């Protein structure tokens, strides 16, 4: 395992050192998005939660293509305000229900330490 707790205050500094292989050792799902919502990184734990194959969703748009259930003011709306503002740090519960059994999760969205990238972290509840 990589030992990093979900919700940790300095998580963006810790994850700045990991490559795709290290990200697969986290105890929670991790997605890195660009400012348009395209998927740059997608770890093994997220694929275990949602059924998606990580290598197949990199490059797709999360809000348009992969996760239309998140295209709502409650999820995408928060993301886009964060990108526009250049700051984002929010945690909320959500249900993922597209082409899968409805699954309740906790989501943490946080701006990355690098400029135009954003993390989405997911764990079951």
Where does this chain bind ligand HC4 (CB under 6 A)?
A: 46, 50, 52, 66-70, 96, 98
User: Least distance to ligand HC4 from the beta carbon of 46, Å?
Assistant: 5
Alpha carbon distance 49, 6 (integer Å): 15
Give min distance, CB of 115 to ligand HC4, in A. Answer: 23
User: Quick one: 30 or 86, whose CB is closer to ligand HC4?
Assistant: 30
CA distance 76 to 98: 15
The residue of the chain with the least Cβ separation from ligand HC4 equals 69
10 or 74: whose CB is closer to ligand HC4?
74
Between 75 and 83, whose beta carbon lies closer to ligand HC4? Answer: 75
d(CA 92, CA 116): 22
Find, among 71, 74, 70, the residue nearest to 103 by Cα.
Answer: 70
**Shortest CB 63 distance to ligand HC4, Å:** 9
**Rounded Cα–Cα distance for residues 27 and 56 (Å):** 21
Question: Of the two residues 29 and 82, which places its CB atom closer to ligand HC4 in the complex?
Answer: 29
**Shortest approach of ligand HC4 to residue 13 CB, angstroms?**
23
The span from the CA of 101 to the CA of 117, in Å, is 29
Give residue 97's Cα distance to chain centre: 16
């Amino acid at each position: 395992m990589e030992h990093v707790a979900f919700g940790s205050e300095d998580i963006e500094n810790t994850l700045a050192k990991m490559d795709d292989g290290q990200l697969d050792g986290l105890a929670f799902g991790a997605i890195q998005l660009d400012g348009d919502g395209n998927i740059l990184q997608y770890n093994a734990a997220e694929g275990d939660i949602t059924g998606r194959d990580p290598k197949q969703v990199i490059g797709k748009n999360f809000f348009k293509d992969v996760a239309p259930c998140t295209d709502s003011p409650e999820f995408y709306g928060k993301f886009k305000e964060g990108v526009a503002s250049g700051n984002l740090n929010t945690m909320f519960e959500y249900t993922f229900d597209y082409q899968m059994t409805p699954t309740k999760v906790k989501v943490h969205m946080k701006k990355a330490l690098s400029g135009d990238s954003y993390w989405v972290f997911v764990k079951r509840v």
